[PDB]
Amino acid sequence: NRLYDTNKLHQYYSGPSYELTNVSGQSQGYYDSNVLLFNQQNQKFQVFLLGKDENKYKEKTHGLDVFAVPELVDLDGRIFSVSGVTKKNVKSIFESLRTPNLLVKKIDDKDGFSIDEFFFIQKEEVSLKELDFKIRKLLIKKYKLYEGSADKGRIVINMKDENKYEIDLSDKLDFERMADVINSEQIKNIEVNLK
Amino acid sequence: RLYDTNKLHQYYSGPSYELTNVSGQSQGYYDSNVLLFNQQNQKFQVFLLGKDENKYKEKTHGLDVFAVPELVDLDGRIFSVSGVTKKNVKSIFESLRTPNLLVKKIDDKDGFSIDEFFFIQKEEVSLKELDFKIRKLLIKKYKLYEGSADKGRIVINMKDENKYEIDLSDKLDFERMADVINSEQIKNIEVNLK
């Protein structure tokens, strides 16, 4: 009933992900969706532009990064994923490297905690999709998220200008939010509250 | 025999069009009720020949239409039958719909069973669309109407044990093209080729 929802979340966030870099593409119609196809590595991809990206790559675009997670894989091995597209780094890896604190907490009377987790972001421009997936992946492996221990909660990304991005851990990140992009240099910290 | 098979092949391997989020009201054209649309840069006339006959008397909005040409009139308007449904309210990956698609052929010439999956993007899908896409794929991958695969059936099993059965020997009956199906209720699809 409710446990079935958690099993699917566990399955997805503990599953495969892929980081593609400096990709070139152009959007094309796949029924009533606009998608990007490509073959980096020995894998084939099809990225559905379902959010703010819906109408941005009509002409051939170079220098893209793509964080992909399979929603499904078709019969010829092509991986269907949603958004997760950004511009590649302009500077070198160590110049653009950010290590904001990842604070993981549970404020329960006699079963609580507050732990600083190391977290690093390699990209200058990073999709919320990538942050969401990597953070949950880490929560599943180190805090038993979706394994009958932690089940609900949120991830809060705090920016230097004080705006925040918030994600509810009770369900998968909204498909229409997976195209949101964040300037990693501007992330002040990230806080997770488990319950 | 040979003339019918080729007619089925060109029909099911031929063009189709998908209109999304359209508006309209039915009108008359000779002995039938029809809907007229002008989406993209193409003109259509959909014949409401089944359960849809009087469904669109009032102006209706947010419709999806699966069109296959039965013929193109002198002015270039495409004549198609039914295939009208309500559009999606959620993303195509939400509660993702990939019912199993089993394609079998066990007889003297072959002996196989392939179990793929059919990605149904619409929450509400016409039997017309299912019929057309299944056959289009059978032609392309299993050479239906192209040599050995000439007859057979498509069975769409619903979760409540009810089902839709379609004979591959002929074109889907025009009166069945307005049958709408809740995609989330399809359990599996089984194709038996002979």
Side-chain angles (χ1 to χ4, degrees):
Chain A
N1 187 9
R2 294 286 296 186
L3 194 57
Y4 178 91
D5 299 349
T6 293
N7 293 349
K8 279 190 168 175
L9 294 167
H10 185 276
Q11 169 170 333
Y12 183 85
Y13 286 105
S14 66
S17 62
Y18 305 80
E19 296 175 26
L20 310 160
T21 309
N22 191 23
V23 294
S24 304
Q26 177 176 348
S27 61
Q28 54 175 107
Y30 178 75
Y31 302 104
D32 46 13
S33 300
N34 286 319
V35 306
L36 293 171
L37 288 55
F38 54 88
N39 296 349
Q40 180 164 130
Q41 298 160 350
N42 297 14
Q43 277 294 348
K44 307 175 190 297
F45 295 93
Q46 180 163 318
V47 181
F48 289 70
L49 305 173
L50 305 192
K52 303 188 193 316
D53 55 4
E54 184 176 352
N55 301 128
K56 279 189 172 57
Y57 309 119
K58 296 299 180 63
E59 287 67 20
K60 195 176 196 297
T61 310
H62 300 288
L64 298 170
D65 285 355
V66 175
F67 182 79
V69 180
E71 300 302 330
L72 69 59
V73 184
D74 67 9
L75 188 52
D76 50 29
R78 189 173 297 276
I79 301 166
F80 282 36
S81 186
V82 178
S83 304
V85 183
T86 53
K87 290 189 171 190
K88 67 184 184 72
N89 285 357
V90 164
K91 293 175 178 180
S92 63
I93 187 67
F94 294 99
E95 303 184 62
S96 51
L97 173 58
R98 304 300 168 185
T99 52
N101 185 34
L102 169 56
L103 179 61
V104 180
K105 306 194 303 177
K106 182 175 177 185
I107 72 175
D108 195 3
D109 185 19
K110 290 181 179 177
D111 186 345
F113 56 74
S114 178
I115 307 188
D116 290 351
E117 288 289 343
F118 178 77
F119 194 74
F120 78 109
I121 303 169
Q122 25 48 308
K123 300 173 84 321
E124 299 165 359
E125 184 180 86
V126 68
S127 66
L128 185 63
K129 175 191 184 67
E130 171 168 3
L131 294 180
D132 173 61
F133 190 92
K134 282 175 156 54
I135 291 169
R136 302 198 207 199
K137 173 177 179 289
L138 185 157
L139 297 174
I140 291 172
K141 71 204 179 205
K142 307 181 67 168
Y143 296 90
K144 304 186 68 173
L145 179 63
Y146 309 128
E147 296 185 358
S149 183
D151 199 344
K152 302 181 176 179
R154 59 169 174 169
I155 305 170
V156 175
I157 300 167
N158 289 303
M159 310 302 296
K160 293 180 182 171
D161 69 10
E162 291 179 311
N163 281 280
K164 60 79 171 177
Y165 291 85
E166 182 171 316
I167 303 164
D168 185 351
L169 294 175
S170 299
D171 64 5
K172 185 185 298 179
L173 179 61
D174 296 4
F175 294 113
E176 295 172 343
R177 297 177 74 186
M178 292 175 174
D180 290 13
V181 303
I182 305 173
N183 176 348
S184 63
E185 184 277 321
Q186 289 291 308
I187 294 175
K188 191 175 196 177
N189 60 62
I190 304 169
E191 176 174 330
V192 172
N193 278 279
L194 302 175
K195 56 191 297 72
Chain B
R1 302 175 184 178
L2 181 164
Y3 175 88
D4 305 14
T5 299
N6 197 15
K7 178 184 170 183
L8 293 171
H9 182 270
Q10 73 184 24
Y11 183 87
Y12 288 105
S13 69
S16 66
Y17 306 87
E18 302 199 6
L19 308 184
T20 62
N21 192 20
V22 288
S23 290
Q25 190 172 19
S26 66
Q27 68 192 64
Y29 174 87
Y30 290 82
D31 59 312
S32 54
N33 292 343
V34 301
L35 287 174
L36 275 55
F37 299 96
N38 292 12
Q39 178 177 308
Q40 303 160 342
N41 49 345
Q42 203 77 63
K43 292 187 288 67
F44 300 84
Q45 170 171 316
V46 177
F47 288 71
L48 308 171
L49 306 183
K51 291 176 181 58
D52 52 355
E53 195 168 52
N54 299 302
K55 282 194 66 177
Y56 306 108
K57 298 309 186 193
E58 299 288 320
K59 189 166 183 180
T60 306
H61 306 259
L63 299 176
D64 278 351
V65 180
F66 182 75
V68 174
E70 299 305 327
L71 69 77
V72 176
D73 83 0
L74 289 162
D75 306 312
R77 186 173 297 275
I78 304 178
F79 282 28
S80 182
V81 175
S82 301
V84 183
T85 58
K86 283 291 182 175
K87 73 201 291 195
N88 282 359
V89 157
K90 293 178 170 58
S91 163
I92 55 176
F93 298 108
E94 193 162 348
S95 298
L96 177 50
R97 291 166 291 270
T98 58
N100 321 71
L101 171 55
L102 178 68
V103 177
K104 307 197 310 176
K105 185 174 181 296
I106 288 67
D107 50 33
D108 57 341
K109 190 184 185 62
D110 296 61
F112 69 74
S113 178
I114 317 298
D115 69 56
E116 315 174 53
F117 68 83
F118 196 60
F119 179 33
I120 304 176
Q121 297 161 302
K122 287 172 50 52
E123 300 160 8
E124 178 177 292
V125 67
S126 62
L127 185 62
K128 180 186 188 64
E129 177 166 342
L130 291 188
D131 177 58
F132 190 89
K133 290 178 171 180
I134 291 170
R135 296 184 202 231
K136 182 171 60 180
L137 171 156
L138 293 178
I139 292 178
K140 200 278 297 307
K141 296 184 180 179
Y142 304 91
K143 311 302 178 177
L144 181 71
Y145 314 128
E146 215 158 52
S148 187
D150 178 21
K151 308 176 178 178
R153 68 174 182 182
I154 300 175
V155 181
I156 304 177
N157 294 308
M158 305 300 293
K159 290 174 182 173
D160 64 8
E161 294 190 8
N162 294 334
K163 57 192 175 184
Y164 297 87
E165 185 173 337
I166 308 174
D167 185 341
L168 293 167
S169 300
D170 63 7
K171 186 187 293 182
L172 181 64
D173 174 9
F174 294 132
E175 298 182 31
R176 303 175 69 186
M177 292 175 174
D179 288 356
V180 302
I181 304 175
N182 175 355
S183 306
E184 182 284 326
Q185 289 292 308
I186 295 165
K187 185 172 188 171
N188 66 45
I189 302 169
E190 303 176 331
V191 180
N192 277 283
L193 298 172
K194 44 170 289 182

